[PDB]
Structure formats: structure tokens, C-alpha cells
Amino acid sequence: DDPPEIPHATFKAMAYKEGTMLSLYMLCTGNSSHSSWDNQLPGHCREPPPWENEATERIYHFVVGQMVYYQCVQGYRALHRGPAESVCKMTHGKTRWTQPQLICTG
Amino acid sequence: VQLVQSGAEVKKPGSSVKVSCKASGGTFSSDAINWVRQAPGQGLEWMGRIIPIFGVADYAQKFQGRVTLTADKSTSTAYMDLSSLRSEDTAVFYCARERGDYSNFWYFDLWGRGTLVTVSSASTKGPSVFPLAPSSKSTSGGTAALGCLVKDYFPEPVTVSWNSGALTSGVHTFPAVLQSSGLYSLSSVVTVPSSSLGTQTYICNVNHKPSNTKVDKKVEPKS
Amino acid sequence: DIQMTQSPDSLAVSLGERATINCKSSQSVLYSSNNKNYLAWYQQKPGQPPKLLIYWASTRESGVPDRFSGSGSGTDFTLTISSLQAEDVAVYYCQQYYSTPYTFGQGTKVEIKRTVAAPSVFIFPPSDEQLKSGTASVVCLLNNFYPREAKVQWKVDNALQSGNSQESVTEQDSKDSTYSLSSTLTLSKADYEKHKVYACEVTHQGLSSPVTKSFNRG
């Protein structure tokens, strides 16, 4: 699926679990030595460098175990504590995303 | 973005003071302005927080009831107000900014320079300069120690200087000590070779701006 | 009201050698959801505002040299300054931004340590200008000594003088890593005139036996 969408919030990811995809699609390839994308933190790729003719949006299909952060958009403040995080955890052979605990107010 | 604060203050017991903190950036956008006090020779403490975008202020237990925190959106400024000043409130107050988009509780990104507040009942007085004449015995060829005495001046600071800055080899300017009468005092001593005496001279230039005072004196062994 | 307890209050390490500071919290700070530790370390060089050093108890902040490195978790945090240099002398504080009110620590005065040096002693008789004003003050000087602690006694006519003496200490000189001490007592014109013997006695680790310097009025 996709990360849950919180009002006035823009999810972000520091590092992508190996297996993410963005010529059909890019692919994060990693070995013991290092990890790097192909088809142009260990076990995790870094953000791919820009390449011209971009789409204004980046679409990522996320494998199990991805981690993200939620930041309130400009003009709002976080009522609760801590950078909220969302992870995908297998449950009874069903993929799902953990719900964050965050509200942005203004 | 930069946080700019007010200047120093020299008030009297029982009076009231207001310290302002202004941001050179755009505004306070979902930020908070925390206030930190540091009495001399003491650790930093915590006043409380003001959240401009919310209009809500939180205070520490100790200082609840004696400080009022104000934020003005139009000029993007934060204010601190002290009521019923005691003699023990002499300290420095800092601002701190904590970004709020990630979380409510957060570290302090940017700090102001700090606002020095002195609370005492005394009159602006010029310093008194006296010569701490060099020892006739001294070290007997090793070194000679001589200095000038600065006392009964208010308020600090005083910028002592020697030979108009020509000599800075061994000058020691101790931090001033508050006397019982309320007048500050400090002394500055320079160490020179024994044979240097009798041929080359010393002057302890002293400056105290708050009274616009210029005092100079000559130091020489009594012999 | 989580409360910080640094230890030691002051610390002295040789130049270019490992230093360590601790921190204690009454309540645990590790947040279950994030598995992050809301603890920050600050550095405050004298007469300047503090600057952030480390956040989340391990994440070095941008522009901080690689030598600084936090560690620990739960309630047993620590900081390390591997290969300490001259620019590291400062006071380092904890902070507990887990919840309000934020609480700082006592503060630790990281201070470079060197070999001991014997203090020098000098005494200055009162100037005649103060005599006209009716007050007298004598100055005893202790110059270029390490370590920190030293004792000074003001002795008049072989009688111990108490409650009328004040002193000040300069912070460590950067180029030489020493200290200095000066003591001065308050006496009126009537009080200073009748007596004849004024002496200064000092006791320090560097000095083998106490050294006295005295002057005779007139």
C-alpha cells in the first residue's frame, strides 16, 4: 500500500530499505560492500541524485520494514512529542502500515 | 535568522525591568522562545516558554508569579518582565528558539547574546585609582610585581590598560569583587624584570564609560 | 521534574587525552515509539552564549568536530572528548527536553591539567593616598601556580585575622596554563596605624613548607 496521509503533513524518509523501486523502474541494489541504485546506513540506499526530465513527484513502492517521518507543513505546530514514525509490518500474511500519532494545529 | 536582544540595565531594588528579544528573520513561525537565566558563577536555569503562534505560555515552578512573558506578532518580538526585584536577581537572560514542526519538545537551535541586569542601590560613581607600589625587595633580580588598585566604582566594567597597550607581557586583571558598601573593586598587576625599574616607566590607564571618566596614574617604588 | 546530576563537578585531564563526563536522570528518557533518547549536551565557553553540541544523545550536530561523541542510553548517559585540544576548555551541560520544565545540569568545568608549579608571593604596603582618605588596604599576591587550591592567612602582630579578607582568582591563562591569586583586607586609619607587623602566609601542594612575607610599617 502507501503510507497513511495525515492532514497538514508531508511524510519523508531518511534511508530506503533495499528493494525500493522508482526503462521500467530504478532499483536499490546492495551487497556487503555497499549499496547503490542501478538501471540509470548499511542495507539502505541514499537518496538518488537528480536526473533531468524529472517528474515533480517521486513515486516509491516500499518493501516490508520501511521507516518514515512526519513533518507538519509550514504554518502548523506539532501538539504531541517526538518525530512520528510509520513502519510496514507483516501481520498474518497481510501487508499494512502502522498508524502515526500526530496532529498539526494552527 | 538571528535573535537580537536589548542592552544592559542597572536598576534599583523594588523596581521593574523589561527585556526584549527580536528575530532578524521573518517571524516566529510555529516556534517557541525559551528563556534561560544564569546568575554569575552558577549553572543555567530555565524560566519558561512562550509559543507565539499559540498565545500560550508555560512557566517553571520556581519563578511562577514573578515573571510575565509577552510576544508581539506585528514586530515579531518576545518580552520578559520582572516584578519586585530583589538584590539577588543579578544575572544574564538568554533567549532560545526551538523549532516545532517535528515535535513540541525539542532542542535549542539558536541562542541570543544575553541581557545583563544588575540590581543594586548605588549612585553612578567614578573609580578610585591607587598605586600598589612595587616591592623594594621583590624577587631580588628574578622579577618585580606592581599593580594599580581600582575600588569604589559603580557600575562595572572598567577597562584597565597599561602604557596605552604597549605592555601586555604579564598583566593580570582579576575579576572584580563586590564590596559590602555596594561598590565594586578590582586590581590589575603586571610582572616585570627587576632591572627594568629606574629606566622605563609604567602607567595604568583606567576607563569607566558609564560616568565618562578617564583616570591615569604613575606607579613608582617609594625608595 | 526530571533532574540532572553531572559528575564530576570539575574535571582535569592532560592535553590530548581522553575525557569523560556523565549524566543521570531521575526518570527514564528513552521514548518507546521512537527508541530515541531526548538528551542534549551544550558547550558554553566563558562570556558567550551556549552552543548546541550533541542531540538525541548520539547525533553529532553539523560543524562539530568528530572527536566529540555522545553515548549511553536510558539514564546513564555520557560524553567523550577524545584527544582534547586547547579549544575544548569550557563548561558542558546536560538538558532534559523529554518534558517540561526542562532541567539543566550542575555543569562540569573541563580544565586542562599540567605539572604542579610553586606559587610566587609578593606583598604591597598601603599607599599614602588611601591614608588621607582614612582607609588602609594591603595586598598579597600569589602568582603562576597550579593546581587550583591554595590557602592564604592574614596575620597581624602574630594574631590571626578573620572575616575582613577578600580574594579573587583569574581563569587559567591559555598560553601557560597557570593561575593567580590576590588577597586584600580592609582596615581603617586608626586600626592600621597602631600595629607594626603585617604578614602573609601561604600553603600549597607545590610548596614544601609554608612561606611568609611581611613588612614593617614606616
Author numbering:
A (entry chain A): 5 to 26, 41 to 58, 100 to 165
B (entry chain B): 2 to 224
C (entry chain C): 1 to 218
From the paper:
To investigate the interaction between BT942 and human CD25 protein we attempted to determine the structure of this complex using cryo-EM. However, the intrinsic flexibility of human CD25 protein had hindered our efforts to reconstruct the whole complex. To address this issue, we reconstituted the CD25-IL-2-BT942 Fab ternary complex for cryo-EM sample preparation. Fortunately, the binding of IL-2 stabilized CD25 further and we succeeded to get the density map of whole CD25-BT942 Fab complex. Density of IL-2 could be seen only if the threshold of the map was set to an extremely low value, suggesting the remaining flexibility of CD25. Considering the poor quality of IL-2 density in the cryo-EM reconstruction, we described the structure of CD25-BT942 Fab complex omitting IL-2. The resolution of the final reconstruction reached 3.2 Å, which allows us to analyze the details of interactions between CD25 and BT942. In this structure the binding site of BT942 at CD25 is on the opposite side of the CD25-IL-2 binding site, consistent with the observations in vitro where no IL-2 signaling blocking was observed. Hydrogen bonds and salt bridges around CD25 residues Q130, C131, Y135, R136, A137, H139, R140, G141 and P142 contributed to the interaction between CD25 and BT942. S31 from BT942 heavy chain CDR1, G101, D102, Y103, N105, S104 from CDR3, N34 from light chain CDR1, Y98 from light chain CDR3 contributed to this interaction.
In human, regulatory T (Treg) cell population accounts for only 5% of CD4+ T cells, which are characterized by constitutively high expression of human CD25 (interleukin-2 receptor alpha, IL-2Ra) and immune suppression. CD25 is highly expressed on tumor Treg cells and is a potential target for Treg deletion. Using immunized human antibody transgenic mice and phage display technologies we identified two human monoclonal antibodies, BA9 and BT942, that target CD25. Here we identified two human anti-CD25 antibodies, BA9 and BT942, which did not prevent the activation of IL-2R signaling pathway by IL-2.
